[PDB]
Design a protein around this ligand. Sequence first.
Ligand code: HEM
Ligand code: HEM
Ligand SMILES: CC(C)(C)OC(=O)N[C@H](CS[C@H](Cc1ccccc1)C(=O)NCCc1cccnc1)Cc1c[nH]c2ccccc12
Ligand SMILES: CC(C)(C)OC(=O)N[C@H](CS[C@H](Cc1ccccc1)C(=O)NCCc1cccnc1)Cc1c[nH]c2ccccc12
Lengths: 435, 435
Amino acid sequence: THSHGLFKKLGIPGPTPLPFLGNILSYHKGFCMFDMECHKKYGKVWGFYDGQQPVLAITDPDMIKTVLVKECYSVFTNRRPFGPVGFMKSAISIAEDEEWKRLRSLLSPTFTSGKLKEMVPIIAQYGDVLVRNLRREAETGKPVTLKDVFGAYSMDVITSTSFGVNIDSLNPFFLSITVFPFLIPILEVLNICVFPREVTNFLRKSVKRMKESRLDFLQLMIDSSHKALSDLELVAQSIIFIFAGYETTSSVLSFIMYELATHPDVQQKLQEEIDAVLPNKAPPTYDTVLQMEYLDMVVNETLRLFPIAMRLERVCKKDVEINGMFIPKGVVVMIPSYALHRDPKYWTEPEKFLPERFSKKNKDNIDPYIYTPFGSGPRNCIGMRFALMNMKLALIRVLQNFSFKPCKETQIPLKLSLGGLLQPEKPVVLKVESR
Amino acid sequence: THSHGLFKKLGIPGPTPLPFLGNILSYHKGFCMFDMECHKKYGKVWGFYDGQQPVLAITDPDMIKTVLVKECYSVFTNRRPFGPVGFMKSAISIAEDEEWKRLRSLLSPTFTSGKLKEMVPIIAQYGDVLVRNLRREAETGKPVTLKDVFGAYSMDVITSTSFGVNIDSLNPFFLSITVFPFLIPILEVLNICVFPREVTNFLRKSVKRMKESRLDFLQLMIDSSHKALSDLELVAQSIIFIFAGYETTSSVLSFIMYELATHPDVQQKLQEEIDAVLPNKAPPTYDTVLQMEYLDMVVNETLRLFPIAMRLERVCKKDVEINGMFIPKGVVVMIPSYALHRDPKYWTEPEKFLPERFSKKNKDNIDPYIYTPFGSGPRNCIGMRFALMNMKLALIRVLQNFSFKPCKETQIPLKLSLGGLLQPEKPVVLKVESR
Ligand code: HEM
Ligand code: HEM
Ligand SMILES: CC(C)(C)OC(=O)N[C@H](CS[C@H](Cc1ccccc1)C(=O)NCCc1cccnc1)Cc1c[nH]c2ccccc12
Ligand SMILES: CC(C)(C)OC(=O)N[C@H](CS[C@H](Cc1ccccc1)C(=O)NCCc1cccnc1)Cc1c[nH]c2ccccc12
């Protein structure tokens, strides 16, 4: 526990670390309550220790811009190592330094404004499966678990958008990682993997069946100043894209319908805009989705209250002095997204759901280095524009046909998962009525 | 690699161990070819090293009886430690010393001749589901994967026989364990488990739902000179019983139909006996199943060629001198079942399928410490009698309605899985015809 003197040395405040465990006992309320607490206790800058690992929290918008944008390529290029990963080390979210720059370049043109516009005709199909799957549990007044019917939709979208397969989708340990990061190299040599060695084995061969069948995201990889992309590295990117495109889309869509249900005036104000831009229940298109500003305002304000990443992190790969502060090599620099999204020194009534904060009359009084639901700089969420489009296309088709009211078992107020990831404690269950 | 001199010291022959790896590179053809080889090379007794771990192979029937029966309780009480297991350490197949004696006593009366006879009326249902599920893929001349329709049956049997749930069941790393057994205690403290932490979490709560619902194998545990049984220890026994009752029953049943197909004279000789004891396609009963001797002869001879355990093992918990041989504390004593089941110094034409070896005219010329498909002594297969009854009840109802012929894709001869477990390389697929 010799490393527990770094912040005492640097004169940076923070909680006193216990030996070996560091400050991780504080995570007993979740990452987010710990961040919101430390933010209040120490101010703009503090540090703590995930085990022996020093973690410096920064909340200064200038310092955040320095870390995420100005000094990304040079110092803050990678995140805090994750293991064991196995062959998934070559996935873009996990790859480091030059290996990541190459996969970023090769995978970037997948989410152009043009490649997205090609997917709107394809996404529209499963939105109608989503309505019809919802029309069944609606004509029977049985409360609906949203993440089920949303995840069935989100799953349908990601398989075809990246590959082309069409399916009606109705057919405890990481605690030790941070106290035993020295055990990560141990597990890497045992082929153990946080990704099950079966799901990966399924897709590794499934992709090489799809590759040698047509011969989409699967198309653009074999098609492409660097080297070219490999094959086991092609499977790894698909696995990242399939996870994100499913669990992020479904979880946020569930978060949105909970708020639309507990704020019926906003749910009606949005249903009115959807019928105006799309009269006669018109099919949403790429350009109509980009016209609905109150839909974007709802999506944005929901992602303020539930930034599913909670924290942004970068590893300081060498000694730097950013915005007048010395940061030694090896430190993980952390931006507490959840805490800043709820900071009263920037948001009025930050626990209330108020989409009007993002009105064009008010969207200017909002610092983009405080509101970072997708990150910033060269390593932001590569699938941001696709995520916004995917969700918005789902809300339109769903609110065009249904209205949502709370039930007896609806968790009000919603308890967040006091665990790790950002999910609700109890699932989101609402009553669906047909218009 | 200081431990690699033990057998050189004891004057026991065997392959020369490489540093760290021991003799495990020899496993490149499977456990069984290694045993059959070493048996020929060195004779009645040899040793080798799984990593640093000394393993003494014995083939002397007297010495085998000493280890398995005479000296079981005193010296050879447990098998070679298995990890990581987590809460499954309390399962009977895995439990050691006194903890195992208690679970053996508490779980033994589950497989009495009387408790088995109570299950014959219940097993008969899914045998008819098995026929009807087979009548579908038979009236369409589509070759059948036997382990699918057998595993669907074996799964149906084990859930109701132990609990009572009825369902129509149509709705890479252990290599490092033996070079890094010092890593087993490492993994135990990370909650990692060779049993997925999800399947176990499913049944842990599923059982405690069943426990507090009725309030069978599930019945007799809460009902019972020892202490009494726990609850997390109740889930652990269920998991052992469900695995064995599924994968053993299905795999052997597949092995039997492959042989009945490649030896049509035996398949007809057995169909004639089944129709004689059970005329008009009579329903098999507990006592009729025990009357068919040629059915028992087929089952026995199949289990000679494919003893799904391959090896029996016991840990020598203290220095002993058994049958004139010194065996030091810590050594794993191993009986190469597969090798002895194919030893020409005991079997004539041991690669040929010949059920007549087990005729009552010939069943006496067979040493029960050479033919050990279920083990021997106090720690033999506790579910032997149930396994024989379960399989025999399936063969009767299946051969009463169908005959089996090889296909174009039928693997002839059957290659064993050159891996670890005893399975076929390619699945067993045969043509099914309706009588
Ligand atoms: C509501 C939906 C989503 C949210 C809120 C979200 C948020 C984020 C955030 C905060 C980051 C880290 C940014 C940073 O470190 O500065 C990230 C990274 C990433 N996201 Fe998303 N994401 C979403 C959906 C998606 C989707 C649909 C994909 C499709 C593949 C995707 C792919 C990625 C990838 C590949 C990265 C890592 C990129 C890199 O490291 O270069 N995300 N996301
Ligand atoms: C064809 C079917 C089966 C075969 C060939 C088989 C074979 C074996 C063998 C060789 C052993 C080790 C015996 C020894 O070490 O001396 C064993 C142990 C065991 N078997 Fe089976 N088995 C079969 C089916 C079953 C079934 C249906 C069950 C039902 C629960 C079962 C439960 C067990 C248990 C609990 C043990 C460990 C007992 C102890 O350690 O005290 N087996 N089996
Ligand atoms: C330090 C190093 C460079 C090695 O990389 C990281 O250690 N990265 C971690 C990877 S966890 C997760 C792994 C996983 C597990 C099981 C199935 C599939 C994937 C994942 O790869 N997910 C990327 C997809 C995604 C999710 C959410 C939002 N968008 C995109 C954590 C992490 C980095 N960026 C993030 C933005 C948001 C949320 C978590 C992370
Ligand atoms: C040394 C120690 C005392 C600790 O115990 C052992 O290390 N025991 C090993 C356990 S592997 C397997 C584990 C498992 C994994 C995943 C799901 C379910 C179970 C299992 O528990 N299976 C018992 C059921 C069974 C299977 C086959 C035939 N009958 C009964 C190996 C072993 C001991 N006896 C055996 C007879 C036959 C085949 C393997 C073994």
